[PDB]
Symmetry: C2
Subunit: 332 residues, 2 copies
C-alpha cells in the first residue's frame, strides 16, 4: 500500500484498447456478390492496401494526455499482442502497469475492407476487451494512490458498470464518457453510469439519446453531475454547470477535414489535461479544441504530431494571444 | 565475397512469407446478406474467435528444415511487422539474413471469416510479397557461398521467374516447387520454371495441370529435370527418375485428419532435409512422410512439435525398424 509516494495529478483512463485494420479493394464487391448464392457465400477479395491504426478510446485518450505531458495511466484489457502498442505508449509517457493482459484472447480488433463505391465489409473482434470486467481499480489505488480522475470510457459494458461502482466505493472522481455505447446500452444501464460524475462527456446527438433512453430531463441529469461537456461538431462545445451557467467555446478552424476518427477522444484528452494542469473551464476547452483539430487533420487516431510553437500560434488565431499565452504557460 | 568460410549443406528457401488471420462468426452471414442491397453493401460481423498462424510456403518449409536440424536460409520479402516472425524462425535455427524488408508494405496476409454453415468471406493482401522480385540470389552467394539447393516456391510470379533464371545464371541447383501457382500461371510462364530443375514437386492434380497447360508430355518434362516428386494424398508419394525408375512410398498413418494446411510444405521440408543429410530417395520420402503427418495432425502450419523418440517409433510402425534406424541416425 503506497502511502508516502502517491501520484499527484494522475488521470486513469479506462475504456477499450483496440487496433483497426483497414483494407482497400480496388474493384466492386458487387462483382462477386451479384452471381453469389447468399445462403452460403464464398467471397475472396484481392486487396491492394492495408493500414493499421492503434486505437480504442482509452488508448487514444491516454496517448494524447501522454503527448501533452500529463500524468496518465491506461487501465484496460488487451492481449499478449499488445506488446508493441505498450512500447509505443510508454514512449509518450503513458503508464501501462495496470493494463490487464489476457492469457487466451488477443487485443480487440476492427477490420474493414472498403471498395471503389465505398461499400464496406467489416468485422469486430472483442477479444481481451471482455476481461476488463476483471480489473480492480483498488489495485491502481494500492500502487499509485487515488488518481485525480478516472475516465469511464466506452468498454465492455459490464466493465463500465463495475468501474463506475468501484469509483463510488473508493471515493474516486470519475468522468462518465460512454460515447458510442449510448446507442447500445439500455436506459437502465445508462442510468447506472451517471450519478456522482465529475464530468459527463457526449456529443450533441448522444446527449439527446441519453435523455431519451434514461427518461431523465436535463435537470434530472444536472442534479447528479458536476459538469456537462457536450461537443457540437463545427459549432464547438458547451460546458454546462449544475448552477445553470453555460460556457461555449468555438472550434479551432481546420485546414482539412481529413479524418473525423478519434476527434472526440482528442478533445477529452486535451480538456482533461488542461484541467489537471490547473486551467479553468474555458481555457481547458480551448486546449481540447486544438488537440481535436490536430486529430481531424490526421489519418488514424494516434498518428498526429505535437508541435509547441504551432499550437501557440493556432490557439492565438482562434482565441486571441492572451488565451494562447495562458494555455501554453502550462505546456511544453 | 566469402571464399574461405562457405556453407556446407544450406537449403535456401524462396517463396511466400505470410500470416493467416482466421475468424469465426457464430451466426449466418445470410442474416445480413439476404436483406442487403448488393450494389453497395454495408456488412458488419461480430466475431467470437481469432486465430493467427505464421505461414507462407517459404516460411513453412524453412521452419520445418530448421526444426529438423537442417541448414537453412529463408529468402523472401516481408514487411517491418515480420520482426516477431523473424525471432520465431531464428529460434528454430533459420537464417533470416536475406529476408528483404519492405520500407512501405506490410507482410502478406490472408484473412478469412467463416460462419456456422461454413460460408466464407476472405481477403488476400500481397503487401511486401511483390518485392521478392528485387531479391538477388547473388547476394546470398556472396554471403554464404553457393547453397546446396534453392527451393523456388510459390511467390510473386515475377520473383519465381527471376529466381529460376538466376539459379541458371549462377549455377545453383534448384527445386521447381510452384504448387498453387500452377492454377494461375500460363503455360508459357510454367515452361520457364522447369528446365534444369534438380527436383520438381507437385501433387497429382498439379502434375496433370502442369502437363495440360505447358502442352508437354511426361517424357518432355522428364528430359529436363533430375527427379519428379509427386504426392498422392493418402496414397503416398511417387519419386520418378528420368531413367524411368519409380520409387513409391506410402504415408505414415495418421491418428487424426486435423488440418491439411501446410502438409505439402512439410513433406518437401522433410524430404529435402533427408537429402541434405545424405539419405537416399526412399529414406528421404519416409522422413518427409513423417513430417507431413505431424502437420496434418496439427492446426496451423508451424504449430506442430518435433519429438525424436515419437518419430523413431512412428517411422518404425510405418516402414519397419531398419528404415527407422537409418533415418534417425542422421537426426537429433
Amino acid at each position: 500500500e503506497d502511502l508516502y509516494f502517491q501520484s499527484h495529478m494522475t488521470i486513469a483512463v479506462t475504456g477499450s484498447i483496440a487496433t483497426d485494420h483497414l483494407m482497400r479493394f480496388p474493384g466492386r464487391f458487387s462483382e462477386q456478390l451479384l452471381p453469389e448464392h447468399l445462403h452460403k457465400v464464398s467471397l475472396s477479395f484481392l486487396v491492394d492496401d492495408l493500414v493499421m491504426h492503434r486505437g480504442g478510446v482509452a488508448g487514444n485518450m491516454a496517448f494524447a494526455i501522454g503527448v501533452l505531458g500529463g500524468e496518465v495511466a491506461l487501465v484496460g484489457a488487451a492481449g499478449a499482442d499488445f506488446a508493441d502498442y505498450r512500447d509505443w505508449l510508454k514512449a509518450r509517457g503513458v503508464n501501462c502497469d495496470h493494463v490487464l493482459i489476457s492469457e487466451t484472447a488477443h487485443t480487440a480488433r476492427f477490420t474493414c475492407t472498403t471498395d471503389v463505391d465505398m461499400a464496406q465489409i467489416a468485422s469486430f473482434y472483442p477479444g481481451a476487451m471482455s476481461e476488463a470486467r476483471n480489473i480492480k481499480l483498488a489495485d491502481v489505488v494500492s500502487a499509485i494512490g487515488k488518481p485525480e480522475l478516472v475516465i469511464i470510457g466506452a468498454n465492455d459494458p459490464e466493465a463500465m458498470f463495475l468501474h463506475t461502482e468501484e469509483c463510488r466505493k473508493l471515493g474516486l472522481a470519475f468522468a462518465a464518457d460512454p460515447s458510442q455505447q449510448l446507442a447500445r446500452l439500455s436506459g437502465e444501464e445508462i442510468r447506472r453510469l451517471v450519478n456522482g460524475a465529475a464530468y459527463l462527456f457526449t456529443n450533441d446527438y448522444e446527449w439527446d439519446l441519453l435523455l431519451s433512453k434514461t427518461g431523465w430531463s436535463e435537470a434530472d441529469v444536472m442534479a447528479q453531475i458536476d459538469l456537462r461537456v457536450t461537443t457540437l461538431g463545427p459549432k464547438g462545445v458547451d460546458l454546462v454547470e449544475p448552477d445553470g451557467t453555460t460556457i461555449h467555446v468555438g472550434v479551432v478552424p481546420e485546414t482539412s477535414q481529413t479524418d473525423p476518427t478519434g476527434v472526440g477522444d482528442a478533445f477529452r484528452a486535451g480538456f482533461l489535461t488542461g484541467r489537471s494542469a490547473g486551467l479553468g473551464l474555458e481555457r481547458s476547452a480551448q486546449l481540447g479544441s486544438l488537440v481535436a483539430v490536430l486529430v481531424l487533420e490526421s489519418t488514424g487516431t494516434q498518428e498526429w504530431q505535437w508541435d509547441y510553437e504551432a499550437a501557440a500560434s493556432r490557439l492565438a488565431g482562434a482565441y486571441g494571444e492572451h488565451a494562447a499565452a495562458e494555455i501554453v504557460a502550462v505546456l511544453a
